[PDB]
Design an enzyme around this catalytic site. Structure first.
Site, mmCIF file in Angstrom:
data_model
loop_
_atom_site.group_PDB
_atom_site.id
_atom_site.type_symbol
_atom_site.label_atom_id
_atom_site.label_comp_id
_atom_site.label_asym_id
_atom_site.label_seq_id
_atom_site.Cartn_x
_atom_site.Cartn_y
_atom_site.Cartn_z
ATOM 1 N N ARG A 1 0.736 -1.244 0.056
ATOM 2 C CA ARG A 1 -0.168 0.071 -0.080
ATOM 3 C C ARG A 1 0.895 1.144 0.036
ATOM 4 O O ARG A 1 1.558 1.768 1.052
ATOM 5 C CB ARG A 1 -1.057 0.237 1.270
ATOM 6 C CG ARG A 1 -1.742 1.327 1.427
ATOM 7 C CD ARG A 1 -3.178 1.215 2.034
ATOM 8 N NE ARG A 1 -2.881 1.343 3.518
ATOM 9 C CZ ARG A 1 -3.614 1.650 4.464
ATOM 10 N NH1 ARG A 1 -4.943 1.808 4.189
ATOM 11 N NH2 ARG A 1 -3.395 1.566 5.787
ATOM 12 N N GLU B 1 -12.352 5.258 0.118
ATOM 13 C CA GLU B 1 -12.550 5.944 1.360
ATOM 14 C C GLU B 1 -12.756 7.327 1.255
ATOM 15 O O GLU B 1 -12.564 7.912 2.591
ATOM 16 C CB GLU B 1 -11.258 5.466 2.129
ATOM 17 C CG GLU B 1 -9.941 5.816 1.460
ATOM 18 C CD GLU B 1 -8.760 5.618 2.423
ATOM 19 O OE1 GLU B 1 -7.698 5.257 1.708
ATOM 20 O OE2 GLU B 1 -8.794 5.092 3.606
ATOM 21 N N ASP C 1 -11.241 6.468 7.795
ATOM 22 C CA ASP C 1 -10.949 7.436 6.742
ATOM 23 C C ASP C 1 -12.403 7.928 6.144
ATOM 24 O O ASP C 1 -12.526 9.142 5.833
ATOM 25 C CB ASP C 1 -10.165 7.018 5.589
ATOM 26 C CG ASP C 1 -8.664 7.304 5.858
ATOM 27 O OD1 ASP C 1 -8.484 8.383 6.634
ATOM 28 O OD2 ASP C 1 -7.762 6.579 5.464
ATOM 29 N N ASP D 1 -5.268 2.079 12.641
ATOM 30 C CA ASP D 1 -4.229 3.121 11.966
ATOM 31 C C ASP D 1 -4.343 4.420 12.205
ATOM 32 O O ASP D 1 -5.348 4.866 12.949
ATOM 33 C CB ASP D 1 -4.136 2.670 10.460
ATOM 34 C CG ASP D 1 -5.008 3.019 9.352
ATOM 35 O OD1 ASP D 1 -5.875 3.799 9.856
ATOM 36 O OD2 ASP D 1 -5.320 2.420 8.501
HETATM 37 O O1 4ZF Z 1 -11.982 1.896 9.020
HETATM 38 C C1 4ZF Z 1 -11.076 2.144 8.182
HETATM 39 O O2 4ZF Z 1 -11.040 3.092 7.346
HETATM 40 C C2 4ZF Z 1 -9.582 1.524 8.476
HETATM 41 C C3 4ZF Z 1 -9.116 0.808 9.554
HETATM 42 C C4 4ZF Z 1 -7.789 0.501 9.375
HETATM 43 C C5 4ZF Z 1 -6.972 -0.504 10.351
HETATM 44 C C6 4ZF Z 1 -7.100 -0.716 11.519
HETATM 45 N N1 4ZF Z 1 -6.367 -1.708 12.070
HETATM 46 C C7 4ZF Z 1 -5.273 -1.651 11.128
HETATM 47 C C8 4ZF Z 1 -3.820 -1.957 11.402
HETATM 48 C C9 4ZF Z 1 -3.285 -1.735 10.388
HETATM 49 C C10 4ZF Z 1 -3.498 -1.065 9.140
HETATM 50 C C11 4ZF Z 1 -4.640 -0.665 9.192
HETATM 51 C C12 4ZF Z 1 -5.652 -0.564 10.078
HETATM 52 N N2 4ZF Z 1 -7.274 0.886 7.985
HETATM 53 N N3 4ZF Z 1 -8.535 1.873 7.716
HETATM 54 MG MG MG Z 2 -7.790 4.705 5.187
#
Ligand code: 4ZF
Ligand code: MG
Length: 713
Positions: free
Chosen positions: A325, A420, A448, A619
């Protein structure tokens, strides 16, 4: 300081050395030519990149003014159309992407996302294509710890038996016998290409013999039996000499599930990388994974070996097919600057460098290293935070130009469109079309997409609380709209349709109970935080026939544009003062808890206890939703300026206490004004309304660089 000049570019030495000495060798790309290519691509595409970013600000400015001069959804929608925010929906089409691996085109299953700067976590993820069901059940609260089944310093056999039973029942639901239950099995044999299972009385075969996929050892007494269901593999390890196998009625030692079918190595929201040294650590790990020689003091796994039901050998992959990513279009990074001292766009860099590195993963060698990622020879990049189809077309152009610099065939670099942002959601069909020959993936999320939602309609009035957002009309239509667009574009059997992350790492019972809804909704894949979670979530793809679900969903249009555009404003007098306070504290601890680890320790994802000590692994997007929500409440006078300061100060010591047991930790209390973390958290809120699309990275990157610079002495 200290840079290598190449044309208009001043490249940080650490980056320059890494590419020439580590990245380039084995790719048969001339180092001089590569750097000229970089200089050129950067010069050519930078204006466009800037033009798009300016277009977002303009759009947002108009939407702001519109709200301030007022809701009539009919006029709103027409306005979005007039300003070029809502574009006309293209005629039906089917994607044409080729050279895509089976893990993506055909197989439905879990998908892991890991911060690339953590080599340990990254290594575990790549090896999580296969996971022990027993370990997952025993190690988590899926098996309750009640009736004498609590975990301890030593193995608890009462708990083990429950694990075995749960697994035995799973086998019954997934690969049913013509008669009787796996629970009463006593042995497994292979007689004439057919799996016979010995019961106490008689002896049966599979209800569908087609599910028998192979074995290891002698047919008369296999060391394991390979099964297949909904494209996913199940391995029954047989070993009566093992401690667990000794007491098992059929000598079974373990049940192994094909788990994380794909993994996203993350350069974006799960990592903290604010300069050249950081990007290099990230890039180096990526290099090792594609070289196939990354290791910790431990290695990457090789393929597994089996015997077809009627004799003969075969093989299955042992690693999770890797995506990467990249960062999105917004940020610059000082890893490269121009002669004027302007930072170069980070997304442009990621495409070039992650793409260069990924070449190694298409080849098994000694210059490239031993282990191969993609077997069809594609590079899978997930691109986050694009707003609208022009930004998608731009990413595809970038990829095309990078493929030239790298000497790769055109369309080698595939794209995963993350849905997103609001302007991608409502033009989704057009976004996919803009990538109709590169797209391998779309997905939805919560953090996001809601932050964008709050920011886009910032001036419209106060939004509902964050918890409430998961059940709002806009997001339900968004979720369903995503699936529809993908299927309508022919994604079933061609590309992944993904859904969001389970963030509550310790509540696995709950995950097993509820996350089933995602494949039931037609998602060919969805996010899990750990290898353990990938194994548990794999149960869902056994229970649910995703291919059948998608086929049944075909042609349906379950979300309308009005539904998508329904702004999540709060109704009048929605909240008591105690509720307001609870929401503020909630968000403030959320920000303080995540920011303190990011700024002080360069940590982008971890188990962070929330306000009630629930462990959540989120994140950076958690910051965006939380900060935008508070900024919104601030803007419309739901809360005063005093209010917000008092909360941050209440929540800071609590977060301090929550990090006890970490020697690296430095308290934010009692000297808030001297804490770079506390100030970063305060700024993200107070300046939240003025950040472009609510993004947090400008403040964050700045504060982390500030902390690192204070630590330079
Ligand atoms: O809800 C969202 O948009 C979203 C949550 C999320 C993560 C949650 N724990 C993570 C651990 C590592 C990388 C991404 C994540 N990424 N996008
Ligand atoms: Mg995101």
């Amino acid at each position: 300081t200290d840079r290598v000049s190449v044309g208009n570019l001043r490249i940080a030495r650490v980056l320059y050395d890494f590419v020439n000495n580590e990245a380039l060798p084995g790719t048969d790309i001339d180092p001089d030519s590569f750097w000229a290519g970089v200089d050129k691509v950067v010069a050519d595409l930078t204006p466009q990149n800037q033009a798009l970013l300016n277009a977002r600000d303009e759009l947002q400015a108009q939407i702001d003014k519109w709200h301030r001069r007022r809701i009539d959804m009919d006029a709103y929608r027409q306005f979005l159309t007039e300003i070029g925010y809502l574009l006309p929906e293209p005629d039906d089409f089917t994607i044409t992407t080729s050279g895509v691996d089976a893990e993506i085109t055909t197989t439905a299953g879990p998908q892991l996302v890991v911060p690339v700067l953590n080599a340990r976590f990254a290594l575990n993820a790549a090896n999580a294509r296969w996971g022990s069901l027993y370990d997952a059940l025993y190690g988590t609260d899926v098996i309750p710890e009640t009736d004498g089944a609590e975990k301890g310093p030593t193995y608890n056999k009462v708990r083990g038996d429950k694990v075995i039973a749960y697994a035995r029942k799973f086998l019954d639901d997934s690969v049913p016998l013509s008669s009787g239950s796996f629970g009463d099995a006593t042995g497994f044999t292979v007689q004439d290409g057919q799996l016979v299972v010995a019961l106490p009385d008689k002896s049966t075969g599979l209800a569908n013999p087609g599910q028998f996929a192979g074995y290891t050892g002698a047919a008369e007494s296999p060391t394991s039996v390979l099964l297949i269901n909904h494209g996913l593999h199940i391995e029954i390890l047989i070993d009566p000499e093992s401690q667990v196998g000794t007491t098992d009625r059929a000598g079974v030692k373990d049940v192994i599930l094909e788990s994380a079918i794909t993994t996203i190595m993350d350069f974006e929201d799960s990592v903290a990388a604010v300069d050249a040294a950081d990007k290099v650590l990230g890039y180096r790990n990526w290099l090792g994974l594609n070289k196939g020689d990354l290791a910790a003091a431990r290695v990457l796994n090789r393929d597994r070996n089996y015997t077809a039901p009627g004799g003969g050998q075969f093989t299955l992959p042992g690693r999770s097919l890797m995506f990467v990513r990249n960062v999105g279009h917004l940020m610059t990074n000082d890893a490269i600057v121009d002669t004027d001292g302007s930072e170069v766009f980070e997304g442009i860099m990621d495409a070039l460098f992650t793409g260069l590195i990924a070449i190694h993963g298409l080849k098994a060698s000694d210059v490239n290293g031993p282990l191969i990622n993609s077997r069809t020879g594609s590079i899978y990049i997930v691109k986050p935070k694009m707003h609208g189809p022009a930004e998608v077309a731009f990413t595809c152009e970038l990829f095309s130009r990078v493929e030239d610099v790298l000497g790769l065939p055109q369309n080698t670099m595939k794209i995963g469109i993350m849905d997103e942002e609001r302007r991608t959601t409502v033009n989704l069909k057009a976004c996919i079309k803009a990538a109709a020959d590169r797209v391998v993936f779309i997905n939805t999320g919560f953090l996001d997409r809601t932050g964008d939602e709050i920011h886009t309609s910032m001036e419209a009035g106060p939004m509902v609380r964050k918890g409430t957002m998961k059940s709002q009309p806009w997001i339900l239509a968004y979720e369903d709209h995503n699936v529809d667009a993908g299927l309508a574009a022919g994604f079933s059997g061609r590309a992944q349709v993904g859904k969001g992350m389970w963030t509550m790492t310790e509540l696995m019972a709950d995950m097993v109970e509820t996350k089933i809804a995602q494949p039931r909704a037609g998602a060919s894949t969805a996010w899990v935080p750990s290898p353990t979670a990938a194994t548990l979530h794999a149960l869902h793809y056994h229970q649910v026939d995703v291919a059948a679900v998608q086929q049944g969903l075909a042609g349906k249009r379950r979300a309308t544009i009005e539904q998508l555009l329904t702004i999540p404003l709060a109704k009048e007098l929605a909240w008591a003062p105690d509720e307001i306070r609870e929401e503020v504290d909630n968000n403030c601890q959320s920000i303080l808890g995540y920011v303190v680890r990011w700024v002080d320790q360069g940590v982008g994802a971890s188990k962070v206890p929330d306000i009630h000590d629930v462990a959540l692994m989120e994140d950076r997007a958690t910051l965006r939703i939380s900060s935008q929500l508070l900024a919104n409440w601030l803007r419309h006078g739901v809360i005063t300026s005093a209010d917000v300061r008092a909360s941050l100060e209440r929540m800071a010591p609590l977060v301090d206490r929550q990090n006890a047991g970490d020697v690296a930790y430095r308290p934010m209390a009692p000297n808030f004004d001297d804490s770079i973390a506390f100030l970063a958290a305060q700024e993200l809120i107070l300046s939240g309304a003025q950040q472009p699309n609510g993004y947090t990275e400008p403040i964050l990157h700045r504060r982390r660089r500030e902390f690192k610079a204070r630590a330079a002495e």
